Design a protein around this ligand. Structure first.
Ligand SMILES: [Cl-]
Ligand SMILES: [Cl-]
Ligand SMILES: [Cl-]
Ligand SMILES: [Cl-]
Length: 217
């Protein structure tokens, strides 16, 4: 049951934690730890505050590059629940202005720092990562995160795992646009051959294509 860590490329680690949700049971969630010299930054938390604390302790004690900032990819409880816990551990949290506003509407805490990328297709660089807003998909505010040195694209919940045809949690999905959002991300990062969904194994670009097909009306 401890959070698991694996190295995906130079300066890039993946964390993976599990939670049990009836009826189907165990489900994984993935995030990234990105080395930034003397410190590291976090791309999405684990399921809960205890697992997120494990990630912070691992960066401090095993990597010996403490996590000092983090980015959060949309306004859902498993992504935004840890804003205060990260704050209490001295991590500067980041999210888009839209994610913060939706977080507050949905009864969640916003990130402490805001990134402005409101137009579909707009990008910003943050801690050496490219942050793209590709339009609504899984959630209206979902962003993706591309690491250009290793060409690793983190898709979060917006990318479905494997060859599934299931859609995951679509309570807040933009079913009109989600397929186009996936194509926007694929076109924005053509060199990224490693794609990380929130809930499955790391894979190639075939999961961008599969997601786009299965979420299209
Ligand atoms: Cl406080
Ligand atoms: Cl925004
Ligand atoms: Cl999902
Ligand atoms: Cl979800």
């Amino acid at each position: 049951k401890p959070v698991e860590f694996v190295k995906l490329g130079t300066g890039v680690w993946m964390h993976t934690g599990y939670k049990v949700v009836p009826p189907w049971g165990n489900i994984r969630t993935n995030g990234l730890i990105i080395e930034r010299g003397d410190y590291s930054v976090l791309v999405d938390t684990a399921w809960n505050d205890a697992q997120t604390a494990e990630i912070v302790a691992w960066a401090k004690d095993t990597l010996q590059k403490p996590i000092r900032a983090s980015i959060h990819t949309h306004a859902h409880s498993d992504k935004m629940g840890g804003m205060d816990a990260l704050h209490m551990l001295g991590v500067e949290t980041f999210a888009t202005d839209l994610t913060n506003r939706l977080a507050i509407e949905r009864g969640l805490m916003p990130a402490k720092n805001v990134l402005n990328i409101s137009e579909i297709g707009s990008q910003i660089e943050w801690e050496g990562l490219t942050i793209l807003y590709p339009g609504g998909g899984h959630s209206e505010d979902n962003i993706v995160v591309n690491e250009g040195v290793n060409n690793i694209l983190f898709g979060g919940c917006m990318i479905r795992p494997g060859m599934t045809t299931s859609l995951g949690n679509i309570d807040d999905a933009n079913l009109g646009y989600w397929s186009k959002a996936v194509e926007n991300a694929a076109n924005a990062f053509p060199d990224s051959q490693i794609v990380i969904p929130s809930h499955g194994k790391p894979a190639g670009r075939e999961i961008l294509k599969n997601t786009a097909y299965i979420t299209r009306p």
